[PDB]
Write a protein that binds this ligand. Structure first.
Ligand code: HEM
Ligand code: HEM
Ligand code: HEM
Ligand code: HEM
Lengths: 146, 141, 141, 146
């Protein structure tokens, strides 16, 4: 993914203020909550039968932290999102067999979570820069297919 | 489709938007044109510059369409009727773009209604926008 | 939705399928599992090997569902009603997979009905399958 | 895109029997006919108001030949679909601004056209091998985005 000096600052400056803990599980929860069919991949997490149920679910909060990490890792190697996610690709593609479309969904929920968190700071331009990133991650994650 | 719980969740959230419906609508459009440039091929006769009066004026029309969809949440088809031929037949809008606007609309709402944009209300709006889009594309199949 | 022309185009084509509906249905499924492997995570208790009696038996059920959708083309919702909760709620099938089956179904039909699979009939079936899928996922939003 | 010796034969053997002329415009026409919103990109082709209208439309037949060529070209360089479509990517992405989803659609219509043309010869395995290719082309064509 490209990213201009301006797009770089906008993203990084904002990403620095993120809460590695909360934000992490917030995106994952909403995903499972907004796109129910995703739960089929986390049955071993217990009661996901309700929002409060999944939103509070500790297994979520925990795994969401790992996902956030994965992104932070991508932002560091935008020049090589491919090698950066190579192992993750194999995992989700060959092992788990998750459809790429759902990666796209996670990126978008992430985007929503951030807009909610930062509010008026998440200006349109900041979003556009982030859609670029999310688009880049989703493509790299799904490389073990094409 | 939209359950009783969704229906109430939608009404509530839109109630909050209130008189800002028009400005949030202009904001969603702008977010879309920026994050999703292919959608601009549909507004060539538009000056998509930031403080564009055209964008602001169209965001109002979009917001009012949505306001009406909510007001007739139980009969969106007949209600949105006109908007369907305009988009589907007349402008022949690529269905995938409805997904992009719906996303920017949720982003806009989440950036203004921190208290209301809870997970449940979020899923609700998604379902709602999902439905509104379905109708606006109903003329395709 | 489906116009008078579509409705007749659908009835005609399905009429041709005739007694082969069950075997075409088994064939579409097989095409899907092969071309789109992610869809297999839904049939783990299935022996998806080629001449699998399970696949053949399920292709029949799918075909009959479709036969019924056509027979009640004007009321697919109420008709497919049961199939909707099963797929949407029970199995929570990823909506995108409905697109993949619909495509393999058109491929199957085009490989058996060379005379009927004209452009117009093609678009018609697409719209039809598009609708059937919408109903089977209607429980999501 | 990978492709095993078996997938290679299945594809190539079948592709050799294709009619560069007919098949070409058949895919393009059906696309415009089945996914009407695509016509907005070919208004300078005249009457597309009806199937017979577009199906017979000579501008279609003609451009479809160029598309078929593009694919043949991809089948030859599956190892490097990226450089093979580099110019085409720029064209459709930066210039035309076509959404990737529609590339996917064209691939699938192509697949249908071929199944219709070859019938019982287009066995499931042959299709799977071809979906791989089409998937690969669509991704390469849309590289000027991510
Ligand atoms: C959007 C990009 C995504 C990122 C960055 C991401 C990242 C990760 C990471 C970091 C792990 C833990 C792997 C490890 O323990 O080494 C993982 C596991 C997993 N992911 Fe994702 N993921 C993504 C999307 C998805 C999606 C959309 C689904 C589909 C439901 C999904 C389902 C899973 C599952 C079920 C596991 C559990 C495997 C385990 O026990 O570790 N992921 N993912
Ligand atoms: C949430 C769904 C949408 C709603 C409620 C909406 C609503 C409307 C409304 C109210 C109008 C004004 C038409 C009139 O004056 O009668 C309109 C026009 C139009 N819409 Fe949308 N729209 C939607 C999605 C889209 C999408 C996805 C696109 C394409 C990116 C789009 C492109 C247009 C265009 C180009 C026009 C004509 C603009 C003009 O007057 O020059 N709309 N829409
Ligand atoms: C064209 C749309 C579809 C139709 C008409 C269809 C129809 C059916 C029918 C008739 C059944 C039998 C259920 C019963 O015995 O009551 C069923 C079950 C099921 N369907 Fe589908 N289906 C569709 C799409 C899908 C898709 C996209 C998937 C997922 C890839 C899928 C996965 C399943 C599964 C796993 C079951 C349960 C199988 C079992 O009994 O173990 N179906 N469907
Ligand atoms: C699926 C892969 C596709 C391939 C291989 C393909 C290939 C090509 C080729 C070979 C050309 C002619 C370029 C030249 O003259 O050098 C072209 C032009 C064009 N393509 Fe595509 N295309 C693809 C998909 C699409 C899609 C989905 C659309 C969207 C409607 C599209 C719209 C156009 C348009 C409007 C032109 C005309 C530009 C001109 O005047 O040359 N293409 N494409």
């Amino acid at each position: 993914v490209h990213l201009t000096p301006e797009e770089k600052s906008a993203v990084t400056a904002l990403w620095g203020k993120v809460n590695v803990d909360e934000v992490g599980g917030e995106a994952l929860g909403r995903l499972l909550v907004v796109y129910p069919w995703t739960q089929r991949f986390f049955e071993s997490f217990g009661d996901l039968s309700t929002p409060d149920a999944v939103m509070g679910n500790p297994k979520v909060k925990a795994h969401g932290k790992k996902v956030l990490g994965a992104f932070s890792d991508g932002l560091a190697h935008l020049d090589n999102l491919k090698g950066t996610f190579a192992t993750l690709s194999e995992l989700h593609c060959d092992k788990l067999h998750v459809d790429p479309e759902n990666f796209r969904l996670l990126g978008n929920v992430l985007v929503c979570v951030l807009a909610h968190h930062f509010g008026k700071e998440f200006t349109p331009p900041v979003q556009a820069a982030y859609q670029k990133v999310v688009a880049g991650v989703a493509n790299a994650l799904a490389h073990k297919y094409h | 489709v939209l359950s009783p719980a969704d229906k109430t969740n939608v009404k509530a959230a839109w109630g909050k938007v209130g008189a800002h419906a028009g400005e949030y609508g202009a904001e969603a459009l702008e977010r879309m044109f920026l994050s999703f440039p292919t959608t601009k091929t549909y507004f060539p006769h538009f000056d998509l510059s930031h403080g564009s009066a055209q964008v602001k004026g169209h965001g109002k029309k979009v917001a009012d369409a949505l306001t009406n969809a909510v007001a007739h949440v139980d009969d969106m088809p007949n209600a949105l009727s006109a908007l369907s031929d305009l988009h589907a037949h007349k402008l022949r809008v690529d269905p995938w773009n409805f997904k992009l606007l719906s996303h920017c609309l949720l982003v806009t709402l989440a950036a203004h209604l921190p208290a209301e944009f809870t997970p449940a209300v979020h899923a609700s709006l998604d379902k709602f926008l999902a439905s509104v889009s379905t109708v606006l594309t109903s003329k395709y199949r």
